[PDB]
Symmetry: C3
Subunit: 187 residues, 3 copies
Amino acid sequence: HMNSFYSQEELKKIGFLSVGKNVLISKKASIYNPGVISIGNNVRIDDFCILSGKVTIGSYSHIAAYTALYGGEVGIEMYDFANITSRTIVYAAIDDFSGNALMGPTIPNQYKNVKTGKVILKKHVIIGAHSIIFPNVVIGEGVAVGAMSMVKESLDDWYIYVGVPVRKIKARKRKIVELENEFLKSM
Amino acid sequence: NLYFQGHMNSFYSQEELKKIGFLSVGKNVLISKKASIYNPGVISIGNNVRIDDFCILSGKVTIGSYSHIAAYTALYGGEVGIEMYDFANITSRTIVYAAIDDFSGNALMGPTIPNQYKNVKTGKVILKKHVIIGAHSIIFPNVVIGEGVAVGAMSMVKESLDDWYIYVGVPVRKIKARKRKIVELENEFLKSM
Amino acid sequence: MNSFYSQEELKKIGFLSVGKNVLISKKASIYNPGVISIGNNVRIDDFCILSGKVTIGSYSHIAAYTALYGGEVGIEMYDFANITSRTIVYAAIDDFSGNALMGPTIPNQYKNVKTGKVILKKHVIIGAHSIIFPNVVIGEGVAVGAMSMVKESLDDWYIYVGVPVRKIKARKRKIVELENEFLKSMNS
Ligand SMILES: CC(C)(COP(=O)(O)OP(=O)(O)OC[C@H]1O[C@@H](n2cnc3c(N)ncnc32)[C@H](O)[C@@H]1OP(=O)(O)O)[C@@H](O)C(=O)NCCC(=O)NCCS
Ligand SMILES: CC(C)(COP(=O)(O)OP(=O)(O)OC[C@H]1O[C@@H](n2cnc3c(N)ncnc32)[C@H](O)[C@@H]1OP(=O)(O)O)[C@@H](O)C(=O)NCCC(=O)NCCS
Ligand SMILES: CC(C)(COP(=O)(O)OP(=O)(O)OC[C@H]1O[C@@H](n2cnc3c(N)ncnc32)[C@H](O)[C@@H]1OP(=O)(O)O)[C@@H](O)C(=O)NCCC(=O)NCCS
Ligand SMILES: Cc1cn([C@H]2C[C@H](O)[C@@H](COP(=O)(O)OP(=O)(O)O)O2)c(=O)[nH]c1=O
Ligand SMILES: Cc1cn([C@H]2C[C@H](O)[C@@H](COP(=O)(O)OP(=O)(O)O)O2)c(=O)[nH]c1=O
Ligand SMILES: Cc1cn([C@H]2C[C@H](O)[C@@H](COP(=O)(O)OP(=O)(O)O)O2)c(=O)[nH]c1=O
Ligand SMILES: [Cl-]
């Protein structure tokens, strides 16, 4: 009733590819194939998140509650100061919706048409709540995507995007870069 | 170590499945221990089914065979029921309701209020063969989703949908026909068993 | 059958206050119950998160997956308010503009958190998969539809839909007549 996080002790026992310092992971999150999951320093991952398969997170990042990172074999990577708000999904693989293929994990590979590609969230990216990020996209440096937004293509740096599928609505301010430097100085 | 630490998968053993009390459960059935199943005596499931973490199945729910019910998905079947036919699949974080309250302001609402004061709209939800429901979608009561229909991510379905079309939006609109190459694939895949 | 805590388990949780016929999932998360007040006849379902200052009245259903982050300012729901599944209510959020660093991994002085009490008045219903931002008063009798986003207070007795929401029709007031009927039948 205070917090649900693993102790540093139990964290070491999960078997992550790598795990940094001050990492707070919820016991109510699911972690599958931790040997291909790498986490930097100062990371928080909240209840009912799912990390599955190849996932790489840097430093100063919050993965809020209910968020699913399906990294598959090609991987999802987040850079430093990226953050994901609650209930987001990031897929590195998805089934073909068109009608040209059978679908999903109960069906063999030879009948499906899985679309796959590494997803990267560059530095300072923020993903708004209830959003969905499709495979093989780079979310540009300093990009913000609004709540309930859907991204199927890579996003140009330093813009704010909204909607389903997203469209660009205004520049993201770049004062956070100064703040990053100021913050890192003080440390 | 990994398997027993809970970091390979979360599914019940087949021994455990039997102890849950499903009306009917098939072979090769993988259900997360982190899903919630309420009133398993009215729930039945065919063969080759996977139901992921944090799903909820409550009340009358019938799933056939070769179906994935992805993580966070809730199926509230109540007394009227939700049925999915074979090769139907539902992506993450979908909700299907066989009953909802009246939003108009003409009735009181939800499970803390007695029924005489409510005006619950109920009706069976059927997803026919090869239906795919994209992530973060909502299906409302008394809806038939026709054979081969695809609903896009973040879509809301309040009416029955025509077979073999793709629909998107809130509420959904028809955008293009679904291809039917899958009808061949099904035949070819079953023909090698 | 059901996942609710017993009366005995509820009292071990430590709520600032908790009423009778309160049905709370064991698979929900409650953080800082010390600042959480709940009235009578309340149901909170699987995979809910209530964290920080949250006050709920009576005759309210918080459906599954719903997160209420009250932080320090608080979230408050008045009687007969209800929240359908997978809603988020935030009493604080980060500045998205690019003028401020973001989130719990960063000290306050580099961030620009907007904070303010969120209030849902009597007979409010929030449709599934919706988001309510800080410092919003949802007026008495408001319905917001599924997949709504609400960034600003909403006028009483209207139905709103969309992202961000727009007012589409009046909500009917018969529900107040039913409220008084129901309450009357329960006192005599
Ligand atoms: C994206 C966002 C930052 C934009 O807010 P803003 O800069 O104040 O912009 P506005 O509210 O003026 O909207 C500008 C345009 O975008 C639309 N819009 C804003 N947010 C949108 C969204 N999430 N989806 C679709 N459209 C949206 C507005 O309707 C407006 O459209 P118009 O020009 O056609 O009128 C904000 O709406 C948002 O989505 N924040 C998400 C917060 C969150 O998820 N937080 C959780 C973690 S701390
Ligand atoms: C529905 C879907 C298949 C359509 O993709 P597509 O056939 O490539 O079509 P496009 O991307 O060209 O979109 C066609 C139109 O529909 C709109 N659209 C596409 N997807 C939409 C959605 N999910 N919601 C609302 N509108 C959508 C597009 O904006 C475009 O509109 P326009 O005609 O006004 O320009 C795809 O966008 C989608 O939603 N896939 C869901 C995948 C998923 O949820 N997967 C889970 C894991 S396996
Ligand atoms: C909001 C709601 C009550 C409106 O239903 P309705 O009064 O029957 O109205 P309609 O279906 O005619 O829609 C009116 C307009 O709103 C739009 N609309 C309806 N619901 C919408 C929604 N959730 N988001 C965005 N637009 C919506 C319609 O497209 C229509 O637009 P138009 O006039 O431009 O054609 C209903 O659509 C809804 O969202 N219900 C949510 C139920 C739920 O969440 N339940 C779970 C717990 S019991
Ligand atoms: C959301 C969440 C919170 N908590 C605990 C740890 C947090 O320090 C505390 C408050 O979190 P939260 O309510 O998100 O507030 P803040 O944004 O101010 O950190 O509750 C968890 O343990 N797991 C969770 O999933
Ligand atoms: C999503 C999820 C995965 N898993 C485990 C078992 C899966 O075989 C493994 C990977 O699943 P997933 O990451 O969905 O990959 P794929 O689409 O390739 O099957 O993770 C669970 O146990 N429960 C879950 O809810
Ligand atoms: C959704 C849910 C149901 N249940 C149990 C108790 C409920 O009475 C039962 C059926 O609930 P539900 O399917 O929500 O139906 P209704 O609206 O008719 O109450 O399942 C839980 O214990 N926790 C849950 O989160
Ligand atoms: Cl969710």
